[PDB]
Design a protein around this ligand. Structure first.
Ligand SMILES: C[S@@+](CC[C@H](N)C(=O)[O-])C[C@H]1O[C@@H](n2cnc3c(N)ncnc32)[C@H](O)[C@@H]1O
Ligand SMILES: C[S@@+](CC[C@H](N)C(=O)[O-])C[C@H]1O[C@@H](n2cnc3c(N)ncnc32)[C@H](O)[C@@H]1O
Lengths: 387, 397
């Protein structure tokens, strides 16, 4: 209703490639773009996509508090929203993951009654999972800012993943163009030694920022982090991953109340699904091809899709319109204003496809796009993860 | 040297738009594509981008263990890798976040000496942060699978964010096409009552899967989750967000070791940085425009970029090649195989740009694309000494 909007989007971590299709489309559509990114290829790429961009990075300065910079960054965006423009703010990675000015600007915009939305992006933690070959679900994940971790004495779990952002700037309030002197780093190492022990592994992680670079995935002991040559390697794009120390056992009361037991059984805490976490100290080898695995693979020769499976059965015209709604913010806005009007103007849709667009309900769109078998409907069927 | 590769990529959560540019380019470049996605528009989109796709979802069945299905899905991918093909597996969201077969397939491919890589994507947790307007950094974030949370008695922190995936299938071991009766949901609700109290908020979160839909961001008390009408709403794509019950105070020893109070002390721990988390119970109003904020804004009129600021100073030819390397997997592989030959054949690069690309060093590329000041070039010679952005979470910093 009110003129003016703020859409905050991400670029991902690795230059250009980790930007989402929707982030790109919003950058292109914006009246004005404000950006804070940390590699020039991504900056150059953004400038090719919109003629009215402002680099927010110029609002940092030596001995200028980060908070004054962030107040300024968010005010530059919100000023343009107040003038009635469709504004896009761009921050590297996920624009809401360890970022101050995005949240400020959106909350101000929202409080003054403008449309305000954050679009998710690929974070450094997303890259971490991908590059270190770990899954937050197994065995759970604790994520902290390193200074907050120390100052608020945040709990660790030795049975779960621990991820620490900003380990290169422990206790730092003021910006500096030649980087952080991280001489309170030893305080973090003290905490890690107390929680995990001197010989426990810490993985120093830096996601590749350019498409041809390898990630840094260097394992050190907690004690090695005290060596000057090693502590020097930790910088402003460094994250630590600390693997679990032990496997947590199962709670017999919950096992009973969930009915996961037929008489006596033995699914051990150390009996793991392949593959095991390679960073975790003293983890045994797990066999990828056990007899049960071999038997499942043997069944592939006789495989047919089951009766209840729903094959895709759509059309070029329907696929085109669903793609357009995802990749054209203008088309989406029109559809959102008037389902019926929009749906009538779409060429080459079948009566079912048109009807389904008119309603906009998930089931109608699903039936138009998937053949639902008879065996299924005599009862929206989803995959999960076993941990 | 060994022929064949496995690249596993995500599609994000919201249909089509949340796919990354690199996920798309790998899908297009693949010899064979294997996918597991949960909306038809994303599925249809994938099929327009590659001619040799296989839907992995057909390997689920009633009375077939999930583990057997996952062994099968991974083996379909790795079989094609062993034949020397560039294979791409595709999973919705981030392909390594609450997903079994991706990790298995990659670990096998890696162990047998094939090129193997996972490309990250946008997870449901990423969507959650964006839609619920929260930052994992403030005040820290614990993320669990709901059944594992109960069975292993995983610890909560009442001072940090808690995110629980798979709240719609508590204790469920068998696959079935017609969904699941979440009959053991009450076991989760008891644990949440124990940890947080009956009146503590729980946010039922479902990210929009189609671009036109709105997310579900429905706040309930723990007690309200016992009502059948409310419990019925929690399904297979439901995640719970539980906000902090209290703010944690600061440690005086660390405040002293980090030298964060020259004057002694201030009088507050809940004098928050704007904005506050609007899901927290009894969160006070935070002032966005304090006198210090107004003073910072007043300085915008006279602002000039500092001397040390590095303006972009590149060329179309350089921007084009860096974009190509990011969006064309074949160009990237060629470049990686021989930096110098690749660099020689790029048209219209300046001598510095060519030299930078020949080396491949990130510092050299940066210096070819930005007008660097002497002081920053001085510091780099005698780890990367650049000012990078950082978040402030602790008010006293
Ligand atoms: C202000 S935050 C911004 C994070 C960003 N919004 C994201 O989505 O990851 C800066 C911190 O993110 C992490 N980070 C940024 N780039 C990284 C990279 N290439 N590899 C590993 N961690 C990184 C580091 O912990 C760094 O101190
Ligand atoms: C097997 S996992 C796969 C997760 C996916 N790889 C990702 O990156 O989020 C399924 C679980 O993810 C979460 N999930 C999936 N889709 C979601 C949505 N649209 N909104 C909220 N949570 C979702 C739910 O917790 C669900 O039970």
């Amino acid at each position: 209703t009110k003129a003016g909007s703020l859409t905050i989007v991400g670029t991902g971590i690795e230059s250009i490639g980790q930007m989402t299709l929707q982030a790109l489309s919003y950058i292109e559509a914006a009246a004005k773009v404000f950006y804070c990114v940390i590699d020039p290829a991504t900056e150059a790429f953004i400038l090719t996509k919109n003629k009215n961009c402002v680099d927010l990075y110029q609002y940092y300065d030596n001995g200028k508090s980060a908070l004054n910079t962030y107040t300024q960054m968010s005010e530059l965006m919100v000023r343009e929203v107040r003038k009635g423009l469709d504004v896009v703010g761009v921050f590297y990675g996920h624009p809401g993951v360890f970022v101050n000015p995005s949240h400020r600007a959106l909350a101000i915009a929202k409080s003054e009654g403008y449309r305000a939305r954050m679009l998710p992006g690929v974070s450094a933690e997303d890259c971490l999972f991908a590059d270190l070959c770990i899954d937050p679900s197994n065995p759970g994940c604790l994520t902290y800012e390193a200074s907050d971790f120390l100052i608020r004495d945040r709990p660790v779990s030795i049975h779960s993943h621990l991820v620490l952002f900003q380990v290169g700037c422990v206790g730092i309030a003021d910006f500096n163009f030649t980087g952080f002197d991280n001489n309170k780093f030893g305080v973090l190492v003290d905490r890690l030694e107390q929680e995990y022990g001197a010989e426990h592994p810490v993985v120093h992680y830096i996601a590749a920022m350019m498409p041809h670079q390898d990630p840094v995935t260097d394992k050190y002991t907690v004690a090695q982090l005290r060596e000057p040559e090693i502590a020097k390697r930790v910088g402003g794009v460094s994250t630590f991953y600390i693997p679990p120390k032990a496997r947590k056992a199962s709670n017999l009361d919950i096992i009973r109340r969930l009915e996961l037991l037929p008489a006596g059984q033995v699914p051990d805490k150390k009996a793991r699904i392949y593959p095991a976490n390679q960073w975790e100290p003293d983890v045994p080898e797990v066999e990828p091809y056990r007899p049960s695995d071999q038997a499942a693979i043997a069944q592939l020769a006789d495989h047919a899709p089951p009766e209840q499976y729903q094959p895709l059965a759509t059309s070029k015209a329907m696929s085109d319109v669903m793609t357009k709604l995802a990749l054209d913010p203008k088309a989406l806005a029109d559809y959102k204003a008037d389902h019926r009007a929009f749906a009538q103007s779409v060429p080459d849709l079948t009566p079912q496809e048109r009807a389904a667009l008119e309603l906009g309900d998930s089931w109608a769109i699903r039936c138009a796009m998937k053949n639902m078998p008879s065996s299924l409907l005599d009862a929206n069927g989803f995959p999960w993860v076993i941990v």
